[model samples]
Target chain A: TTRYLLAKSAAYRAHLPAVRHRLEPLMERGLLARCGITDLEFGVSARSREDHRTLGTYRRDALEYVNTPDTVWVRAWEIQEALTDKGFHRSVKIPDLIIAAVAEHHGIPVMHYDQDFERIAAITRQPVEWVVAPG
Target chain B: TTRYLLAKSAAYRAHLPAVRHRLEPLMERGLLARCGITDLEFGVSARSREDHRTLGTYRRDALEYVNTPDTVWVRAWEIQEALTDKGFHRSVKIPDLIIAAVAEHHGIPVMHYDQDFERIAAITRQPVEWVVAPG
Candidate 1:
């Protein structure tokens, strides 16, 4: 997903300084355009007005963060390290799950790059092409 | 929380391109002038310093995102569907609860939108009249 986004967004070609600064290192390390990136938006809502009750909800906002030539290696190890550092622990797949959640919530489209999502699909035990565009 | 921020920011109407996007959508929808909109910043915060430890720690930077008149439909189902496509489950009221948790870590603000956060106050059955006016 991340690879397709990088290709489509042409983010690799984006001339913005910040974009370059952030993405360059990732690309050089052969980590850029490697994995799909998703964002999450959390908000609250009432389950019932008369009952005056509410529940928490989240939405997934997916996007391709690594589209540049320089790869940043968004490996599961790195992802797990980042999340665990922040104090999130439960299921082994929680990190990826959260990424999926954020992607769905934001109405952002997921991009697939070079069948990389296949591994992710396998890990989650979902259809390999579930979120991929027809190649 | 929304009102307090509208008061604090005096954002009754700003001339930004998209700042008014959400608020106006809700106001015309008659869902504006009520409730708070918290911007959930979901980033990978690592846990372990080593051993390839990566977990999602979601730091709550509570900044009141509702400093405008055009509140949009950021309610729960909107959020739920967003996540469902991405696939997330468990724990009802997960939306607002997520908001509270996000606020704790992000270093944002939970501006009291308005003291009148009552009647239909405590929208989430959490707190009431939580108008967030720093002044």
Candidate 2:
């Protein structure tokens, strides 16, 4: 998930060496690419121009961010409908739903620190990985 | 946009004949389709089971409700990036950006009663039509 990457970036900005140490290996492997939504998210979530530029530089230098798959949207709608059918859709965030949908469509696991992914996975049974145990 | 459809649904629930009168023709034409994100938004935003079901019935009975195009995500990321470059990304909603991106990619004018569409069009120069003048 983008949250994991953002957390890594946040660790860098805040000088949290330990957190960065824990997160950096996952990002450094160059095995991950971002879903397109992350760009919009990074835009809104960035605290400074330097922070925003960091993501741009990373995108240019390593990450091969891809456009959302058309099928992902259909899966998202189905996933949300399934959640609402069980009466708990209000607890989900729209972006999280889309993020999960992207991963689900691509047959990739979501790496995250958020429980929303777990909640969504309960319905979609999409694969998810917690960076560490959630509190 | 789904907001227009949701307003129409709301008008039905609340019996607001005037608002419904003004909004019904656009919907009655069957010319509009909801972006997939609207399904997720509606799941969270619906006030009751019946309200939620109303959209479902409308989708089944009339609207063709389509999956999002992959390019829509790419365009959304670009539009948000443009907004951020101008320092207004925080002011925009993620869903609205996707909506504008879908309309922009499809070459369809976004028909809505919201100002965000206008704000996004300023950057992408996509067409937008306000259902009525926004106050």
Candidate 3:
């Protein structure tokens, strides 16, 4: 799942390396949309793993800029295409909307070490397979 | 887990083949009890999971039915029981209630091949090991 997310994220970011700079104005206007939050709000704070305290704050904007909804939809199609081309069989049992939401929220580059996605896929029988890319 | 649920449901249905018809009054006026719905309300709907949307709607219902809280107690006891009975020794520490909840809800039949259950178990660190039984 981590690998999948990382791959997805990277794939999308590769297309728009300057997405952050591009979205800066929207983010400033507070319209930057990302998973779970919209542009108006600052992204959540990062907590200290070691001390279990707040280490610093960062916005989702800070993490990765938002992509337009249309871009997100197209990117998700591309991801499905990429995965299929790589020999993965997509399950039609799951909702496409969910897949689209996941793709949109995470950007094209998947985060490699996501415990939550791993857990979710395990329980949901959703696919989450990919080897970690060469770092 | 799907195998487990299918097998469990089959086994229990075999043992007390009369369970549903037997629990008719409870199924009628209501308290016979099972997962989710309790002894009060009727176990909701049974739409046509084939009907596009309503097809999948079956309230944890009239299918196999509930095991007692204490019966649920011991069955869960025996699950971790039988698992350890086989080769699977315990993994130190996930919460017990969640395991207990899953066990309690499903009854001893292990209702093999439950998609929802399979999904949950996959996502969670929980274990759901057991083979199917004879019809």
Candidate 4:
């Protein structure tokens, strides 16, 4: 999203110089953890063996990181309702709510470039470390 | 639900009459498309690197159907933008918009129950083949 936005949005372009410095470290971590990526697996029921096989291969190579969804659904729904009712629904998407829930559940801060996280945080009261672009 | 609603959701049952009062046989056959299970080789990815790989396989299969920049799920974001542009946000859309957007991309319709897509069709003029369950 940041890349796509950078190409077209001057506002995002203004953030590029500064944000690039931060992105470098995240790139190096190569060991960064993902949320559902760990638990989410492929399900098959048809003519396509290619899809599942490719997925299995991909999962095998994935780097490990620590994260879990202890109460993501329950709390995220609460966060979701409050956010939508507050009318940030226009800009905040569902994934933002889930991500916030997971991060909040872990008592960790969010690292993001999208403004939607900030919007979600304002309503859900989660802490967010906005990854902003340079001036 | 036609029967369940009668027993439990008389008010909701009542709303259906008003809701369907606007319904007509607005048929556009063969306008919805979907991800064949074989196509789902991976779960939503990040360094869900498996995700990108699996999607690439299916995208390879349906490459004839769409250009770049659509996915098993990211398409939902695009679909959401369209619906919101027409003035709507929804509950059942976590998996909804992705399916509808994929169908729209394939120039096909979705077959199932669940009002989220119906909501999408209403706002975006996308087509749907509502599938009712036997209760």
In candidate 3, which residue ranges exceed 4 Å CA deviation? A1-11, A14-22, A36-135, B1-50, B59-125, B130-135
Q: Compose the digit string of candidate 4's lDDT tens values, residues B16-112.
A: 6433332211112222222422122112221334433454454444222222122433345434444443344334334455456656665655554
Per candidate, native contacts kept equal: 0.13, 0.54, 0.00, 0.00
Sliding window of 10 residues with minimal summed lDDT for model 2 chain A? A3-12
DockQ for candidate 3: 0.04
lDDT string for model 1 (B1-105, tens) is 222222222132223444456344533444322112221112222235442322122111222232212111233333333334223322323424333333322
Pairs that clash in candidate 4:
A15-A133, A15-A134, A18-A134, A51-B41, B31-B107, B31-B108, B31-B109, B32-B108, B32-B109
Output the better candidate (2/4) by TM-score.
2
**Model 1: lDDT of residue B38:** 25
The DockQ value obtained for model 2 is 0.48
TM-score of chain B of 4: 0.42
Which wins on DockQ, candidate 1 or candidate 2?
A: 2
Clashes of each: 76, 0, 35, 9
lDDT of 1 by residue, A32-89 (tens): 3222222222221223332122222111222223221111223333333444443442
Best by lDDT: 2
Give the CAPRI rating of model 4: incorrect
Off by over 4 Å in 4: A1-20, A37-63, A66-70, B1-94, B97-129, B132-135
Task: Give each candidate's interface RMSD in Å.
Answer: 12.0, 2.8, 18.3, 17.7
Kindly list the per-residue Cα lDDT of model 4 for residues A24-78, writing each as its tens digit: 4543554223344221211111123444345435434442334544355445545
